[PDB]
Enzyme design. Structure first.
Site, PDB file in Angstrom:
ATOM      1  N   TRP A  51       0.676  -1.069   0.064  1.00  0.00           N
ATOM      2  CA  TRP A  51       0.254   0.027   0.330  1.00  0.00           C
ATOM      3  C   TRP A  51       1.263   1.552   0.159  1.00  0.00           C
ATOM      4  O   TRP A  51       2.429   1.069   0.248  1.00  0.00           O
ATOM      5  CB  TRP A  51      -1.058  -0.013   1.715  1.00  0.00           C
ATOM      6  N   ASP A  70       4.923  -5.788   3.010  1.00  0.00           N
ATOM      7  CA  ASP A  70       5.427  -6.312   3.998  1.00  0.00           C
ATOM      8  C   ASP A  70       5.842  -7.808   3.973  1.00  0.00           C
ATOM      9  O   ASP A  70       7.022  -8.217   2.430  1.00  0.00           O
ATOM     10  CB  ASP A  70       3.940  -6.514   4.157  1.00  0.00           C
TER      11      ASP A  70
END
Ligand SMILES: [Cu+2]
EC number: 1.4.9.2
Lengths: 124, 128, 360
Positions: A51, A70
């Site tokens: 994101w 991540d």
């Protein structure tokens, strides 16, 4: 400019949720899980997707575009948990939304920690 | 000369941030390479050329078009040229006539794939 | 000759009408998320249902089965992935059936609109992301994934339409709402797009809806309110009308939270979590107050302490509202304009943003 390479800042503030480039982070700062703000702790796999946030660098008065990739493959790190929502938006702007596990497309999706990769100057 | 190979990975990135088209080119060809390993129905890419201030609008209308329409509105007249969306391990091309680029206004190239134009964007310019 | 003998196979002690469900993400150890079941009348723990990694949950409309969604891996952190929908018996709280799902079911915080069911309870409508989005359809009776609503690509969340057997809407990047009308076979019979309702960049709205029988209200980051009337064949959108008066603006009040709104249909009263001193990045801040709005008159009729709540839910029949701050569940009486705090069930979960009443 030096406010741009965490590598050399003081981990004490680079591990703070207040650190400027973590303005849209909702996870655990990898820099506190055996990794760095731009690397995955040993054994955790980087996510191809992520994101994105538009964080304001208070040191050079500029706005940078940060990508939150991540690290996955390992269970929750549980350290340096942060919930900042600067410039964060709902799912209809999916890549600016952080209420979704960005490890979703990885070989193994379990979430370990978040990274704050610097993309560039915010084009705005 | 008149040829350009732009790439795209599963990481939502273009290796180029701006392309330049020599002025003595009648037509220009743009080849896209998807280095990633992710399929196109999840993280595919394409290249759309359009006036700078038409990007946001074009990207949104194409999103309603769907992967079958390569995420570009059918007969969208704000689009100069666009390529066939493709996922990991695929490549494709598009070839528009450069007389198409106009007087004193900048253009952009992006990916109309839902939400990719936020970062996969750059400038395509006419000049020497 | 043992005097006592341990036995199992027992049903939930409290009647369904008393049960509520707290979805505990247990973020710190998200691979062991579970659903905690409580008696809202007494705050008693009634049982649970393990939901592995980042599980979502809901109760079947007929109030008999507990539908859950989650992700497994032959070795948790490695091995083949299996995204499934599980059907548990509501009274015995036992696993009964596993439904295969394409390996892309949404993995994120527990907003209601990510795991719902058609009004006629025939289908379960879930949200997908790979990251490309799409809405999944599951035939409850067939126990199979029947449709992959890809037209919802570029959209997010599912807002069922209470006035139609098998229809629902979704918010899209264009600021419009996409309606999907399922056929008896669970496949897209027809669809329709509404006109723009709100500005994605100038006034983004929360995906959490204030659902009525034939219309849905949404609140925006800046305290505005939009609507989606779906009483007609097509959706007529509207808005925005501010929740803030001049003094509310002077103090910069704005909506904050996740499942931050609710609607008591019988009174037209809309509930929202508000926090003063709002600005960029405060849209998920704990509730400093809960605001009560009269949708017919567009005015605030009551305001009370938010107890740092983040999500809520409304039970129409009993005129109740439940607020949750992530770990505590508060029980309110909304039979009157001003909410009345009945009790707080402490430690209902470690990290929960969703709570629902058993259907009645
Ligand atoms: Cu792309």
């Amino acid at each position: 400019h030096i406010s741009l390479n965490p590598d050399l800042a003081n981990e004490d503030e680079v591990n703070s949720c207040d650190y400027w480039r973590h303005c849209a982070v909702d996870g655990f700062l990898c820099s506190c899980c055996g990794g760095t703000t731009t690397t995955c702790p040993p054994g955790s796999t980087p996510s191809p997707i992520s994101w994105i946030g538009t964080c304001h660098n208070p040191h050079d008065g500029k706005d940078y575009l940060i990508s939150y990739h991540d690290c996955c493959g390992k269970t929750a790190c549980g350290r340096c948990q942060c919930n900042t929502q600067t410039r964060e938006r709902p799912g209809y702007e999916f890549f600016l939304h952080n209420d979704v596990n960005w490890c979703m497309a990885n070989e193994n999706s379990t979430f370990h920690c978040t990274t704050s990769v610097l993309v560039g100057l915010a084009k705005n | 000369a008149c040829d350009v190979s732009i790439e795209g990975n599963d990481s939502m990135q273009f290796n180029t941030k701006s392309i330049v088209v020599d002025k003595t080119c009648k037509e220009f060809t743009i080849n896209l390479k998807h280095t990633g390993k992710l399929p196109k129905a999840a993280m595919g890419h394409n290249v759309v050329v359009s006036k700078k201030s038409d990007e946001s609008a074009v990207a949104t209308d194409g999103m309603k078009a769907g992967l079958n329409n390569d995420y570009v509105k059918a007969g969208d007249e704000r689009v100069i040229a666009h390529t066939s969306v493709i996922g990991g391990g695929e490549t494709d091309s598009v070839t528009f006539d450069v007389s198409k680029l106009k007087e004193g206004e900048d253009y952009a190239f992006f990916c109309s794939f839902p939400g990719h134009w936020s970062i996969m964007k750059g400038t395509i310019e006419l000049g020497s | 000759k043992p005097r006592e003998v341990l036995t199992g196979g027992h049903s939930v002690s409290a009647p369904q009408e008393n049960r509520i469900y707290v979805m505990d993400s247990v973020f710190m150890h998200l691979t062991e998320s579970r659903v905690h079941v409580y008696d809202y009348t007494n705050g008693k723990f009634l049982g649970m249902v393990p939901t592995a990694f980042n599980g979502h949950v809901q109760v079947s409309n007929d109030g008999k089965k507990i539908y859950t969604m989650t992700t497994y891996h032959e070795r948790i952190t490695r091995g083949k992935r299996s995204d499934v929908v599980e059907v548990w018996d509501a009274d015995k709280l036992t696993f009964e059936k596993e439904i295969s799902l394409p390996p892309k079911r949404v993995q994120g915080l527990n907003y209601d609109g990510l795991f719902r069911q058609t009004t006629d309870g025939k289908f379960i409508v879930l949200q997908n992301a790979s990251p490309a989005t799409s809405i999944g359809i599951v035939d409850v009776a067939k126990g199979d994934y029947v449709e992959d609503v890809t037209a919802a690509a570029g959209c997010w969340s599912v807002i069922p339409q209470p006035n139609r057997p098998r229809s629902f809407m979704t918010i899209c990047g264009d600021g419009g709402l996409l309606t999907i009308n399922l056929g008896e076979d669970g496949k897209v019979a027809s669809q329709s797009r509404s006109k723009q309702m709100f500005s994605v960049k100038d006034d983004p709205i929360f995906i959490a809806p204030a659902l009525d029988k034939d219309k849905a209200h949404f609140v925006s980051y800046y305290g505005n309110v939009y609507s989606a009337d779906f009483s007609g064949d097509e959706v007529k959108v509207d808005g925005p009308w501010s929740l803030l008066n001049d003094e509310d603006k002077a103090k910069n009040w704005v909506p904050g939270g996740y499942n931050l709104v609710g609607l008591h249909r019988a009174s037209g009263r809309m509930y929202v979590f508000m926090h003063p001193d709002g600005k960029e990045g405060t849209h998920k801040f704990p509730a400093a107050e809960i605001w009560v709005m009269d949708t017919k008159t567009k005015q605030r009729v009551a305001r009370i302490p938010g107890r740092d709540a983040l999500s809520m839910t409304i039970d129409q029949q009993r005129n109740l509202m439940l607020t949750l701050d992530g770990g505590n569940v508060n029980v309110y009486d909304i039979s009157q304009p001003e909410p009345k705090l009945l009790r707080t069930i402490e430690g209902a979960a470690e990290a929960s943003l969703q709570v629902q009443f058993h259907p009645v």
